Subunit: 133 residues, 2 copies
């Protein structure tokens, strides 16, 4: 690997929990700034943004479930950073859930009011990017 | 280079496709029949002013995507006239110049992979690939 492939591998291994972590501009949030904390069993790390917690990562242990939540004050996008996820959604007005399988690079848009739950689909650590608008 | 598992192979295929060095597209899924899903398999790059862009076919259509930069390529100055954005480096290295409303000084920032910069509404910003390889950034607008 060259230097940039090396850097991308180090970043991914940090997000996966298997590596060590990798200017005074307030607008910049460096990957070195991402500190994971566990909430309800799931590991979260968010960039420093003007409005807190608008862009971050969720790290899931093998086959780990995140119980149903509801998108509220911002529309939500979930984008697979590594691994594979099952996502179950129930939009307002509908009675039948939708099931989605997402591999790396795939995303799903969760509208306001939609109820959604997430499960790591594989027997390895998976990582989801969470984008609030 | 440790022998990749299946998920590492998928991640590498995706990144090679974003870099334009790989002709195999990211893998598809039957979930791409779902209205709310935008799969990486659906992405297609279009060139504007020499820069390759590909956006997820989300409902608002121009809010989450990728910019692919040729070696040392520059994207000329733009004003974030309507939507603020976040630039998040997916591969490579970028130099970003910003001039924010109410300020006099242009500010220079260097971003490596996983680094992000927030571009406020009204800020004038330019981007140059800092290295002699294709670099890729994710563009997130709000």
């Amino acid at each position: 690997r060259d230097e940039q492939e090396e850097a991308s591998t180090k970043l991914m291994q940090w997000l996966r929990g298997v590596g060590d972590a990798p200017d005074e501009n307030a607008s910049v949030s460096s990957a070195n700034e991402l500190i994971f904390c566990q909430v309800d069993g799931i590991d979260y790390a968010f960039y420093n943004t003007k409005e807190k917690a608008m862009l971050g990562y969720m790290r899931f242990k093998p086959y780990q479930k995140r119980s149903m939540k509801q998108a509220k004050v911002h529309p939500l996008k979930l984008l697979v950073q590594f691994g594979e996820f099952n996502v179950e959604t129930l939009a307002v007005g509908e009675e039948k859930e939708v099931h989605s399988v997402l591999r790396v690079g795939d995303m799903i848009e969760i509208d306001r009011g939609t109820r959604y739950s997430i499960q790591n689909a594989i027997d390895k650590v998976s990582v989801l990017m969470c984008i609030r608008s």
